[PDB]
From Swiss-Prot:
This is Mast/stem cell growth factor receptor Kit. Tyrosine-protein kinase that acts as a cell-surface receptor for the cytokine KITLG/SCF and plays an essential role in the regulation of cell survival and proliferation, hematopoiesis, stem cell maintenance, gametogenesis, mast cell development, migration and function, and in melanogenesis. In response to KITLG/SCF binding, KIT can activate several signaling pathways. Phosphorylates PIK3R1, PLCG1, SH2B2/APS and CBL. Activates the AKT1 signaling pathway by phosphorylation of PIK3R1, the regulatory subunit of phosphatidylinositol 3-kinase. It is linked to Piebald trait: Autosomal dominant genetic developmental abnormality of pigmentation characterized by congenital patches of white skin and hair that lack melanocytes. Gastrointestinal stromal tumor: Common mesenchymal neoplasms arising in the gastrointestinal tract, most often in the stomach. They are histologically, immunohistochemically, and genetically different from typical leiomyomas, leiomyosarcomas, and schwannomas. Most GISTs are composed of a fairly uniform population of spindle-shaped cells. Some tumors are dominated by epithelioid cells or contain a mixture of spindle and epithelioid morphologies. Primary GISTs in the gastrointestinal tract commonly metastasize in the omentum and mesenteries, often as multiple nodules. The chain holds residues 547 to 693 of 976 of the full protein. Induction: Up-regulated by cis-retinoic acid in neuroblastoma cell lines.
Amino acid sequence: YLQKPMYEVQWKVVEEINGNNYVYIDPTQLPYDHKWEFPRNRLSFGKTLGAGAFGKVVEATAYGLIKSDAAMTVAVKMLKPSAHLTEREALMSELKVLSYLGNHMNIVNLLGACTIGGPTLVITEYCCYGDLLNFLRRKRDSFICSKTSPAIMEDDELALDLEDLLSFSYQVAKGMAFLASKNCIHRDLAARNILLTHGRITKICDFGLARDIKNDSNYVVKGNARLPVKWMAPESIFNCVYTFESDVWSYGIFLWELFSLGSSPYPGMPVDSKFYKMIKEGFRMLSPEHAPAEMYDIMKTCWDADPLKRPTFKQIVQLIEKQISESTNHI
């Protein structure tokens, strides 16, 4: 009888200085270069990586994607088989946004698409170690004791250490700097939306299509929707505005997840009316045990009540570059 909720593109591109303020570009207006088209008969689906309320992401092998004589593992985003054309247009819009952004080492990049002659599919890079949240949690024990035998995740049987966390901080800052440089806001930055691939390279993405948000307690009901309130800036929670500066707030929360070895933020504090209150009154999380003071300093600035006093990602990148440099022969 009526329309159920629809998948929407998570990342937004915004219009260049509304007036130190923000408005979204309708992604349908973005161009789509059909150079991305890949014949669907050259895709072989494997395991479902996750299924959410609107669709799923699956591992697949794409044959001749880049080199004619070479197969390649990819990830494929798709809606439910029953999805109508307007629902499927969201995936077209996602394709347009990824196309527009272009390629960076620290995002999950577009590799191709199947948008003709069948179900709409978006082919992206496959990240073999999965999401960073799960990685941190499974590798946690190896951080706490190096002699322990680390969780084997695909071909990665190495421990996690401080240098890993520093590298992840840096890489994610670089990927977010890249997004912001393209006037792109993520709006759901969190360890669950950062994936890990060969060389422990972190790639920022939106993995929400593979997630059942109703069964994820990190998303809470607020105003008809389910939102990652613990990652959100006070001004997003209260004014429903997402900005470059609220992405920075989220990155600060991500740094807390990182150095807490994948703890959920504000542990044991439900998102209720007093949570909202104490956030606006200036309550902030304490440092993670394993965070360098310098990294917690970054966190604290990411959480400045005044959005204009938060660092940009460009500045965070410069700050972490200085930390890593100064941390040599000190780890």
